[model samples]
Target: DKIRILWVDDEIDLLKPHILFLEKKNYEVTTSNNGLDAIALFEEENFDIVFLDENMPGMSGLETLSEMKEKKSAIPMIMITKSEEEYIMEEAIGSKIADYLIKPVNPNQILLSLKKNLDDSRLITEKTTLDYQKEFRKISMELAMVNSYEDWVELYKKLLFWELKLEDINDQAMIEILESQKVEANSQFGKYIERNYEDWFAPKADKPIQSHNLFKELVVPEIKKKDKPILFVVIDNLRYDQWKSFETVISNYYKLEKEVPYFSILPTATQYARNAIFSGLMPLDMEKQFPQYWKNDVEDGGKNLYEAEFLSAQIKRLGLNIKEDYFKITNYAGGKKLAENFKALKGNDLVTVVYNFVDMLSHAKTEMEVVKELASDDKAYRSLTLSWFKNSPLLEIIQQAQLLGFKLILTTDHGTINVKNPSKNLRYQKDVYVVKEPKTIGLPAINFIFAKNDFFLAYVNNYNHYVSYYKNTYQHGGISLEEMIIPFLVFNPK
Candidate 1:
C-alpha cells in the first residue's frame, strides 16, 4: 500500500504539478478545496499525513486543523501558510500542528515533511530493532556475569533503558524478548538479594550506598555552596525504570548534573526507606534516637509524622545553618497551593518537596480494582506515572522553579516489586513472632511457612484470602533490586 496524502487548500487545482510529483513517487494524493470538506473527508478516511493551507476558504486552515485533531489527534498534520505573521504561526503550532511550512512550499519540501512525520516511525523502528539485536548478546553476557548488587543495578538499569527505547520502536518480538529478559533478571536478582542482604548492612565491609548514608554522602556536599539552593524532591515508591521513563520529559527543563544509585533499607517500605532518607540513619537507629517521632507498624500513629523534623536534624548535623523550606504535597489542592506559593519560596536557601502521587498510586492499585487494571504490570504502571506527570501541577512547579534559577534534586525513597512466584516453606510452630521489627517471620504455621524472601515474612493464616487479595498487586518491602536500589540525580537549568 502506498503512503496516503491528503492536501487541503482553496487553490487545489493550481497544485496539479505537485500532486503529480507525489503520485509519481508512489504516494496516493487526495485533494479537498475547503476546510469543511477536508474535515468531513478526514472523519471518513484515514490518511498517513495531512497538509492544510492556512488561508483556506469557509472554515480556515487553523479551524480545519482543530477539527481534524478533535476527530483524530494521532494523524500528523502540517500547516502550509502563505502568511509570514509570527502570531498566526504560533497559534497553528500551539494547536499541536506537527510541522509548519511557509507559503510557496516546494514539492520536495512537502515530500520531506511527509517522510519526516509519516515514515519516521518505520525508519526508527528498523534502526532500533537492528541495533538492539546487535547489543542483545552483550547484554545477555553481562546479565549472566553480574555478581554484586552494584553489578545487578547497572545491568538492570541498562536493560530498562533498552526496554523503554525499544518500546517506542513498536517491535513486538523485541519487546517480548526484553520482557523475558526482565523476568530472568528479576529472578536472579531475588536470589542475589537473598544471599548478600545480611552482609550488605554489616558494619565491617565497605558497602554500596544505602538509604541512611545516601544524602550524607551524595547530597550534603552538593548543597554546601552558598549560592545554589537544592530543591530535593523525593517521590515515594518510584522505581528506577519509571525514573528512566520520565528522563526525556524532565530533560526539557533541566540538564542532569549527576545520576547515582543507592539502596533502600530493608522492608523497602516508606516507613523505613523514606525515614532513612530524611534522618540520614537506618530505621533501627531512628527508633532508638527519636522514640517520640518514630512509629512502627504496630504503633497506632502515623509512621512518617516527623519527616520535616528529621530533615531539619540531618541538615543541622552537617553543621550548616542554611535557611530551608519543606513541602509535602499529597493532594491536588496541596500541589496547586505549592505551585501558587512557589514565588514566596525564593528566600529559602534549600527547599524540599515530597510529592506523594507515585506512592499513592502504588497503594491505590492494591486496593482499587480499576487502578489495578490500569497499572497491572511494570510497563503499564510506568506508563500511568508518565501520563500523570505530563499533566501534573508538579511539572508546572518545576518549570516555574527552573525559570527562577533553582537547582533541583530528584530522588526516590525506594522502588517496588511486582510479586509473582509465591514460595512456600514450613517452619516449626514456635519460632514466629511479629513485633513490627524491620525483619520478621510471623507465626510458625505448620502447613505453610512464611519465608521472608527478601523482606519480612507474614504468615499465611488465611492463605486463600491473602493470596487472592495481594496477588499481582504492586508491593514493596521485598528484596529485589528494583524495590531497594533507587535513582538519584541532580539537575540545573541550562
Candidate 2:
C-alpha cells in the first residue's frame, strides 16, 4: 500500500518542490492551503500521516490538529512551526504531535520524519523476528547439552525471555513454533529430573537451591545481612512466567535486588513443597521431627494449617532472636484487612505473608467455566494474573510496606502445569506425581504409583467424567519445568 500524506499550510504552493519529491518517492500527497480545508479533508478521507502548519491564516493548525484527533486519535500528526517561541513549542508538543519540524525543513528531513513515525514498528518487527530465528537455533542446540540444575535455570530463563518477546510481536506462527520448543524443553527437563533428582539428595553433592534449603541458603542469610524490616511474601502456585508478567508493577514500588530460580521438591504440591519451605526441611524429615504438624496426602484435613508454627520453629532453630509475625490472606476480605492494618507490622524484624489468590485462581479456572474461558491459555492466564494483581489489596499492602520502610522478599512454594494427559492409578486417581516409594524422596508413605510429567492419575470408576473435567486444567505435584522450577526474588523499597 502507498503511504498517504496530508500537508496543510497557508502558503502551500511554496512547498511544491517538497511535494514533488515525496510524490516521486511513491507518497500520495494531499495539499490544503488552510487548516479549515485540511480538517474537512481529514474528516472526509483516511491518511497515514499529517503535516500541519502551526501558523495558519483561518483556523489555527493546533485547532485543526485537535479536530483531527477527535476524529481519529490514532493517526500520526506532525506539526511544522516557524517560530521557536517557548510557548508555541510547548503548545504543539503538549498537543501530542508525533514530531515537529522547524521552519526550514528540507525534503530529506521530511522524509526522515515520515519514516521514523511510520516505519519504526515494521522495522522493529522484522528485526525481532530475525533475532528470534537465530536464537531459536542456539536454544535448540543448548537444550541438548543442558545437564546441571544451574544450566537448566539459564535455559529456562532464555526460553522465557523469547516467549515474552514473541508474545509482544503477536506472530502466531512464531509463537506456535516457540510453544512446540517449550513442550520439547519440558519433556527433556522431566526426563532430566527423573534421572538426576535422587542424586541431588546425596551428601556433599552440588545441587540447585531447592525448597527445603531455600530459607537456610537464601532467605535467612538475607534477613541476617540486613538491619531493615522485611516483608516476606509467599504467593502460592506462582509460575516464573506469571512472576515476569507482574514484575513491572512490583518494580514500581520496590527496586529489585535479586532474582533467582530455585527448584521445588518432588510432588510439587502445596501440602509438601510449601511445608518444606516454612520448616526448612524435606517432607519426610518434617513428618519425622514434627509429626503433630505434618499431614500426609492420604491423611489430610487441612495440610497447610501449620505454616506459621513451622516458620516460627524454624526461625528459632536458626537462632534468629528477632520478633516475627505471620499472616495468611486467602480471600479478598483478609487481604484488604491486612493492608489496612499493615502498619502494625512495621516494628517486627520479619513479617511473612502467604497470599493464596493465584493458587485459588488456578483451581477456580479448572472448576468454573467462566474462569476457564477467561484464562483459556498461558498468555491469557498471565494477563488475568496481571489484572488481578493490579486490583488486589496485595499491591496496597506492598505500598504500605514501602511507606513503612520495609524490604520485600517475594517467592512461591511451587508452580502449576496445565494437565493434558492421564495416567491410571486406581487406588488413588489424582493429578499427582506418584512416588512408588515415598521414602526415596523423603516423602511420607503413599501408594506406589504416580502419573507422568504432564498427566493426571485416573481410575476406571468414573474415569470418563474425571478425565473430561480434569484434562487441560492447571495442576501441581508433578515433575514438569513449570511445576518444579519457580522464581525467588528479593527487593528493596524504592
Candidate 3:
C-alpha cells in the first residue's frame, strides 16, 4: 500500500511539480484548494499524513488544523507557512502540529518529515520483526537447554520482552508462533520446578531468587543507600508484561534502578506468594513460625492478616533499627487516606504501601461479565491496568513521593494467569479428595498434583457443571509462567 498524503493549499495548481515528485517516490497525493475542501476530504477518507498550507485564502489553515484536531487528534498534521516568525511557529506547535515547513521547502525536506511522522512506526516494526527472526533460533535452542530455575526465569523474561515488542507490530502469524513457543516453555518450566523446587529451598549451593528473598536481595540494598525515607509500594498480582506496560508511565516520575524477576512459591496464589513475600519464608515455614498470622485456604479468615507484622519482623531480622510504617490499601478510602497522609510518613525511614486494587480487579474480571468484556485479552488487561494506574491514588502518592525526593521500590507478589485448555485428571477413592478450584485434595502426606490444571476430575459426580462454571474464569494456583515467576523493580526520581 502506498503512503497517503493530503496537501491543502489555496494555489493547489502551483504544487503540481511537488505532487509529481511525491508520486515518483511512490506516495499517493491528494490535493485540495481550500481548507473547507480539505476538511471534507479528511472526513471521507483516511490519510497517513496531512500537509496544511498556513496561508490559505478562505477558511484559514489554523482553523482547519483546529477542526482536524477536534475530529482526529492522533493523526499527524504538518504546517506549511511563509512566515518564519517565532509567534507563528509557537502557535502552530501549540496547536499540536507534527512538523512546520517553510513555504519554499524542498521535496527532500518534505520526504524527510513524512518519513519521520508517517513511516517511523512501520520502519521500527519491520526492524523488530527482522531482529526477532534472527534471534528465534537462539531462543529455541536456549529453551531446549534450560535446566534450572534461573535459566527458566531468564528464558521467560526474554520471551515476554519479545512478545510485547511483537504485539506492537501487525504480525499475527509471528505472534501465534511465539504463543506456541511460550506454551512449550511453560510446560518445561513446570516440569523443572516439579523436579528441583524442594531441593532449591533445602540447603542449595546455588539458588535463583525466590519470593522470600526478594526484599532482602533487591530492595534492602537500595534502602540502605538513602538517608531519606524510601517508599516500598507493592502492587499485588503485577506481572512482567503488566510492569512493562506501566514502565513508561511511571518513568516520567521515577528513574528505574533495577528490574528483576523472582519465582513465586508453588501454588502461586496470593495466600502463599504474598505471605512469603512479607514473611520472608515459604508457606510451610510461615505456618511453623507465625501460625497465628497465617490462614489456610480451607479455613480462611483474611489469609494475609500478618502483612504488617511480617514486614516488621523482616525489618527486625535485617537488624535495621529504622522506624517503619505499613499501609494496606484494600479500598478506595484506604488509598485516599494514604495519599492524604503522605506528609505524615516523611519522618519514617521506611514506608511500605500494599496496593491490592490490581489483584482485586483480576478477580473481579473473573467473576463479573462486564469486567470480563472490558479485560477480554492480555493486551486489554494491560491497558485496563494502565488506565487504573493513571487515575489511581497510587499515582498521586508517587507524585507526592517525588516532591519529597524519596526513592521507590515497586514490586508485586505473584501474577495471575487466564485459565484455558482444561485438563481433567481423576484420583481413585482411596487417595482422592475433591475441592473446589485447584488444590491438593488427598491427604497432605501423599504425593499429589498441584491441581494447576483447569478441570479437576473427581470420582464423585457432576463434572460437567463444574467445568462449565470454571471455564474462561481467571484463577491462580496454576503451573503457568505468568502465575509462577513475577517482577521486582526499584526506581529513583530522574
lDDT of 3: 0.78
RMSD score of candidate 2 (Å): 3.4
Q: Model 1 — TM-score against the truth?
A: 0.79
Q: How would you encode candidate 3's per-residue C-alpha lDDT over 239-353 as one tens digit per residue? A: 7888888888998999987777787766566777777788777766676677788786578456686799988898889987788888888999889888987988788888898
What's the TM for model 2? Answer: 0.88
In candidate 2, which residue pairs clash? Answer: 434-450
For model 3, how many clashes?
0
Compared with the true structure, what per-residue lDDT tens digits does model 1 show for residues 1-494?
99988899999998899899999999998899998888888989989889899886589899888888889989988888798999998898799899998968788998888888877888888999999988887887888899887797789778877877787767777778787777768667766665565556555865778888887998887877666777888888898888887889999999998888887766567777788889988776777788887786666856787899998998888888888888888899899888887998777888889998887888787789899888976778889989988888889889878988999899988777665534331110212212232322211111312123222233467666656666666677656667777888989885
Every candidate's CA RMSD: 5.6, 3.4, 5.0
Q: Write one digit per residue (lDDT tens) for candidate 2, span 1-494.
A: 78999999998888899999999999999999988888889989999999988888788889999999999999999988687788978888899999988978888999999889999887778788888977787888899999888899999999888877777676777777898888889878877777777778888878889999998888898888767998999999999999999989989999999988999987788878898999999989998999899987668467798999999999989988888898889999999999989988777999899999998999997789999898898889999999999999999999998999889999999888888877761112333434576677777774534344578766678888878988889888777788889988889998
Q: Write the number of the candidate with greater lDDT, choosing between 2 and 3.
A: 2
Measured with C-alpha atoms, the lDDT of residue 326 in candidate 3 is 85
lDDT of each: 0.78, 0.86, 0.78
